[PDB]
Design a protein around this ligand. Structure first.
Ligand SMILES: CC(C)CCC[C@@H](C)[C@H]1CC[C@H]2[C@@H]3CC=C4C[C@@H](O)CC[C@]4(C)[C@H]3CC[C@]12C
Ligand SMILES: CC(C)CCC[C@@H](C)[C@H]1CC[C@H]2[C@@H]3CC=C4C[C@@H](O)CC[C@]4(C)[C@H]3CC[C@]12C
Ligand SMILES: CC(C)CCC[C@@H](C)[C@H]1CC[C@H]2[C@@H]3CC=C4C[C@@H](O)CC[C@]4(C)[C@H]3CC[C@]12C
Ligand SMILES: N[C@@H](CC(=O)Nc1ccc(Oc2cc(F)c(F)cc2Br)cc1)C(=O)O
Ligand SMILES: N[C@@H](CC(=O)Nc1ccc(Oc2cc(F)c(F)cc2Br)cc1)C(=O)O
Ligand SMILES: N[C@@H](CC(=O)Nc1ccc(Oc2cc(F)c(F)cc2Br)cc1)C(=O)O
Lengths: 415, 415, 415
């Protein structure tokens, strides 16, 4: 089993080795800060090599994805599924933000903050939006350029670019081939750095354990963080998905959980939504009467773009790092977390071995220190096995809803 | 008539509605500055969405245009027409700058300013030229990077790029197809924002009327601005075009105005140089003896790149905004206005629905506040109907001159 | 002879004319600094026009070169030759750095400098790496963005980009055609500016002679600079190449110099490694028993990428300009000079008429004033005739070594 899947085992071996060296090394002496920096330096190299690639990955991924959208994708079954997928993810991210602001683990006006958000959606310059944001200083008011990448402005402009390119049709074939080649190259580059990763994670954990100044104060917030993620998953799935199934289809949603039970158990087992497709197919289209014209489209795209557990997890785990460093997020960074968690949950599953670049996307979208991310990797393998469960349940309810909103059209195509 | 041309009618409806709300709202009370900012905010969003697109439009337009130049374009009839078109536009912009510096509406050394202009033509870095300029501070002297987009350096480098690409021939076909696709995409994007525009113009006019502090001091400079534009058009057309026709062809230029009179009346009527082609063809090649091998090339390119009324208008209306905000332009910004008005007059007619991005090009080429542009849109529909007249007269005199500089070659091709 | 090769003759005519005008003009009076600036201004224009092109030349050259690598290039004869070429160039640059730090012509911690170098190899942002570097300020420590182009980070990222693109195979053909077209365009642009160059070199020499404040103090360091370059060439060639031939092949290396003597004399004569190929072929494969399957690959690529005299010259001549301006290079700029001299020696011969852009690459890689480069052009034509000799001798020893490391494989392909 050690030779199969040689990335998660090296990651947990690096986490355990780094925790052992940090726990043995803080016992010795008050360590000098320069040798602390020399210990934590390969994790800094890892964070820089991953942050180097969030700009061409956004630029290539938006233009490759949004130009491959077919409006003839079985008619209204495409649009209904897309409206479901972009609604439940937003509800999940909003619930995650509320639950991390209310549980609170890890102990200018608001109008100017919201106007700075609206100004940052529409940047004056495109090359300056790659590394600078705008903000409202005050004494009269004035506008000043702070430093940090403007994620929302680039995402907005390249959404407009991909949508305008997809309407050109076959005239813009050369540009989508160019950006497809750029996307394949940057995905191979993301694959190599994640092979380097189990050395950087170990050094980051050792540097975070050595300089913690108290040990039972971080083991309490790392417990309350798992508690708020579990409360978020339980509330989101168990309440909001049968409720959104009841007000639309008006069928009894407990027989629906009686139907998809084996898919949920297998998603808890294999901890991956992509490998759980032949179980949920045999569950849905053999136990719940869903038509094969619905599942064969809804499920293989929901296993790629419908990640509503990852949205709640990444909307909790960014404000948790904001609360550990004492930062208070204003009204303009809460909306940035809630939008970037939605855009990054779709990207965490569509890009292979990119689960660490999505967290760095949010942590540099709101301008946070990214070196506290090593305390999240030490508990991620206790949480992805339950993230996959909420993802699979959100897929199954979507395949149950899109069939009920499309009974009549399938009946007329049948007759 | 309300359903035909649904952009100028919505623009003048937005201008009248914004002027009514501003004139009624400054009557009420001394308004708080924050709700003034909340009123003028959609115009700020419009200015940011238009300034976002002046860099890829320059980059794509230069490379698409300068690589499509045929040196076999009927031999010397191409080169003679291009020398005429790039001379009368420069004379018109220079006359506009002189007439706005002399009439004066809207009440470091010069050597260092000219050397900073020559340094800004040749930038040290290309990514820094997208958002930063250089300037000479003093106490010894030193050179310091000020903020603002470097328009002339990018225009110079991409003129060199397009000229070097056009000489490669058929080897550089992939790159001109890539930039053609980019140009079509950015022109569709410019089309959408100008549909948004009648909401932003109204908010900008309301925010400029509410915070004017005196009403009869802006209605005087908006009168003197129309007076200097009309004096510029009258002087330029009525003196400089028959004079430049007399010293070249040595024919009596008053019979020439007797010939093209219906084209001038129709250009005053339809207010568009592009729709006035079947009138000026029937005028020229049936009344003035111009050969059909001359007009069929000279007029359909002069209705696109020969806009010498728009050059005078945009060279007056930039220094007018500079004089309203109390800025005094040095010797290095006068030449920048005189060159960018020439480059923007060619672009205002070649790019559809781009008449507001050309003004923002000049106002960010010399670094000026662009929020005063709403006082220019409120009088533009009293001035474009006379801009089109000078454009059509400049086309007709060019077709009268290029025929006289090419009588012998057409005679030998005839015999 | 004046009409043949009309670039070196105009360059030495401009150097002599500028030296005459400077030597006659400093005799007159203490010159005002502003007219000194007006004299030295066209050289500043030349330096800006050459520094404008070091970013697209790097970006296009890396992707064009590294994607054209064939691993089937006669099997192991490619890899052996590449390991030789990238080893002797590094040894030559290191010897040049040591010899210019020891002869010394032209009279924060080191750990933080090396960590800033390692941070600068992996930049956080790609658009910020085009014009900004990072450095460690101190009071606690903190990291601060200084200004200047980050050469090593862009070279590292585009090495990764070209290597990942070359493994895609025939899928990434559109992108290598796009970058080939960009490379041809930027090479034509480099050709034009070097035609402008003999006017800028003259103005730079006149501005450097007028403002020198003492004449016999610069003629001593320009003598010691030629002495350390000659000592470097003599030591490198005459000791390190027969030594590296003795420990590998264990043949007597003095008969090897008895073999390639005519190639060395002809390389001293024609002062060009590219035109000396039919002499060194007739030397090697007719006098030293080298197989024709070895020379026909090793020599025509060694006359392009194996320039180990230019590496020593450009590693001496950058630290010489650093020592003339009083700058002391730390441990992080010595490694930057030693790596950029290696990368620029390969580029000085592969790009035609680009011998001045390679020096500006190093002088902006370590952040130095580039206006002192005019004192290097005044002695370059006394030194290139001996640089070419070390280049040709390094080619001949490589063709002598690669044949000895490949005797058995060629014997089995023969039998
Ligand atoms: C990669 C991170 C750091 C930045 C954000 C990248 C996001 C926005 C990119 C990566 C993959 C892209 C998606 C790929 C596939 C699709 C399906 C298509 O029918 C709609 C567009 C959509 C949904 C794309 C939207 C943009 C997208 C989600
Ligand atoms: C668009 C604004 C913001 C920037 C200025 C864009 C200008 C420089 C672009 C837009 C359209 C372009 C023109 C399109 C057509 C031609 C005709 C050709 O025979 C000569 C080049 C020429 C004249 C191009 C020159 C550059 C050009 C005028
Ligand atoms: C002028 C400078 C700034 C451009 C970039 C410098 C270096 C990195 C560039 C310039 C020229 C390039 C080389 C051109 C030719 C070859 C031969 C090929 O078989 C391997 C790649 C190789 C060796 C390239 C490697 C990268 C390269 C050495
Ligand atoms: N949930 C999914 C897919 C899946 O695994 N999604 C996922 C993947 C990687 C991941 O990356 C992080 C982020 C961190 F901040 C961290 F500290 C450690 C890691 Br690892 C986060 C979410 C399903 O199967 O449905
Ligand atoms: N003159 C031409 C073509 C034509 O209309 N040219 C033209 C078009 C738009 C325009 O845009 C502005 C600029 C402003 F500053 C303003 F405040 C309002 C507007 Br609208 C300026 C010039 C012909 O037909 O010959
Ligand atoms: N050595 C080679 C090829 C060759 O000529 N290489 C070479 C070419 C140009 C050159 O450019 C500089 C640099 C300066 F700093 C300077 F001040 C003047 C000049 Br010129 C430097 C090295 C061979 O033939 O083997």
């Amino acid at each position: 089993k050690l030779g199969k899947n040689l990335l998660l085992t090296l990651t947990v071996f690096g986490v355990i080795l780094g925790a052992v060296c940090g726990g043995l090394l803080r016992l010795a002496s008050p360590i000098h800060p320069d040798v602390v920096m020399l210990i934590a330096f390969p994790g800094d190299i890892l964070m820089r090599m991953l942050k180097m690639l969030i700009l061409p990955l956004i630029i290539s991924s938006l233009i490759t994805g949004l130009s491959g959208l077919d409006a003839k994708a079985s008619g209204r079954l495409g649009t209904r599924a897309m409206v479901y997928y972009m609604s439940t993810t937003i509800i999940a991210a909003v619930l995650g933000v509320i639950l991390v602001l209310a549980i609170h683990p890890g102990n200018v006006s608001s109008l100017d903050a919201f106007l700075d958000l609206i100004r940052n959606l529409f940047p004056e310059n495109l090359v300056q939006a790659c590394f600078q944001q705008i903000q409202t200083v005050t004494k009269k008011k004035g506008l000043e350029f702070k430093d940090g990448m403007n994620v929302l402005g680039l995402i907005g402009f390249f959404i407009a670019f991909g949508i305008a390119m997809g309407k050109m049709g076959d005239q813009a074939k050369l540009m989508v081939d160019f950006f497809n080649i750029l996307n394949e190259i940057v995905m191979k580059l993301v694959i190599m750095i994640m092979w380097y990763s189990p050395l950087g994670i170990a050094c980051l954990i050792c540097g975070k354990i050595i300089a913690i100044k108290d040990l039972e104060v971080v083991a309490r917030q790392l417990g309350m963080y798992m508690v708020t993620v579990i409360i978020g998953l339980i509330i989101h799935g168990g309440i909001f998905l049968p409720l959104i199934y009841f007000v639309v289809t008006r069928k009894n949603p407990f027989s629906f959980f009686a139907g998809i039970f084996q898919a949920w158990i297998t998603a808890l087992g294999t901890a991956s939504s992509a490998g759980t497709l032949p179980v949920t197919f045999r569950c849905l289209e053999e136990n719940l009467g869903i038509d094969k014209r619905v599942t064969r489209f809804v499920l293989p795209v929901g296993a790629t773009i419908n990640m509503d557990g990852t949205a709640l997890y990444e909307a909790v785990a960014a404000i948790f790092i904001a609360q550990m460093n004492g930062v208070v997020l204003d009204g303009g960074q809460i909306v940035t977390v809630s939008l970037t968690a939605t855009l990054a949950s779709v990207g965490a599953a569509s890009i292979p071995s990119a689960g660490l670049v999505t967290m760095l996307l949010i942590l540099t979208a709101v301008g946070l220190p990214t070196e506290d991310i090593s305390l999240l990797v030490a508990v991620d393998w206790l949480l992805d096995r339950m993230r996959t469960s909420v993802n699979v349940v959100g897929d199954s309810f979507g395949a149950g809803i899109v069939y009920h909103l499309s009974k009549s059209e399938l009946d007329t195509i049948d007759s």
